[PDB]
Amino acid sequence: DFSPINCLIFDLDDTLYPLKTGIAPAVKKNIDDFLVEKFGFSESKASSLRVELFKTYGSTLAGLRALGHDVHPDEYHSFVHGRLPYGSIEPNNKLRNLLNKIKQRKIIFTNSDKNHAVKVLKKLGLEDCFEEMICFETMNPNLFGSTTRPDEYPVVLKPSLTAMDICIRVANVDPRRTVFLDDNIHNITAGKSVGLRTILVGRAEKTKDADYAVETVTEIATAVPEIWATATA
Ligand SMILES: [Mg+2]
């Protein structure tokens, strides 16, 4: 049977640029340094808390608020992303050409704040390629003013199905007609569970929940030939 692809949802970090760029370990270091600044922890204790909060709540920001700390998202993102070596993100001309050839609607779906995402897309040369962006603010629209308690509006992040649902609703996605590209195996599982077709980025081998796997995102031009199909049924 034929299901056309009318929409592509792209993760940002480590999907539209390769993991080996080195942004991901810088973000981990920055989160540890944020916890040292907040709590006067050693770096070693900071790392221990980061991974616990990441595992339990989805991120250190999510966890701090769940535990009763009134950490505004801007404080966190300014520290953790603001400090990043954005200069190390290389433009990808092949990718820009590909996205421009692709006729389907293209969406960004990221846990990062919009400010970070826009900086990354600018470095990549992709700032006009996407017609919707579902970012941290999108998933957490009530988290920027006063709250009754620190966790009145719990932080929503990928890979939660809550996050998936917000992406699908904001972008008005038909999951049967949509492919989702992400480097994170848990995000791929979540996407598959809400009916999306899935492309694991950063591995050549598929997980059980990946329809395709490519090491680099530009490989979809040949690995996913249905992108170029013209049938609509
Ligand atoms: Mg990613």
Residue numbers in the entry: 2 to 234
Paper text:
Here we show that Arabidopsis thaliana possesses a highly XMP-specific phosphatase (XMPP) which is conserved in vascular plants. We extended the substrate survey for this enzyme to other mononucleotides and found that it is highly specific for XMP. The loop probably stabilizes the orientation of the cap domain. XMPP is a member of the Haloacid Dehalogenase (HAD) protein superfamily with unique characteristics since HAD enzymes typically have either a protruding loop or a cap structure, but not both, like XMPP.
To elucidate the molecular basis for this specificity, we determined the crystal structure of XMPP with and without XMP bound. Consistent with the monomeric state of the enzyme in solution, crystalized XMPP is monomeric with a two-domain architecture. In the α/β-folded central domain with five repeating β-α units, the central parallel six-stranded β-sheet is flanked by five α-helices on both sides. A 20-residue-long loop (Pro142 to Ser161) protrudes from the β3–α8 unit, and a cap domain (Leu20 to Ser89) with a four α-helices bundle-like architecture is inserted in the β1–α5 unit. At the junction of the cap and the central domains, a Mg2+ ion coordinates six ligands within 2.1 Å in a square bi-pyramidal geometry involving Asp12 and Asp14. These aspartates are conserved and important for the catalytic activity of HAD enzymes. Mg2+-coordination by Asp12, Asp183, and Asp184 is linked to catalysis and is of critical importance since the respective mutants are inactive.
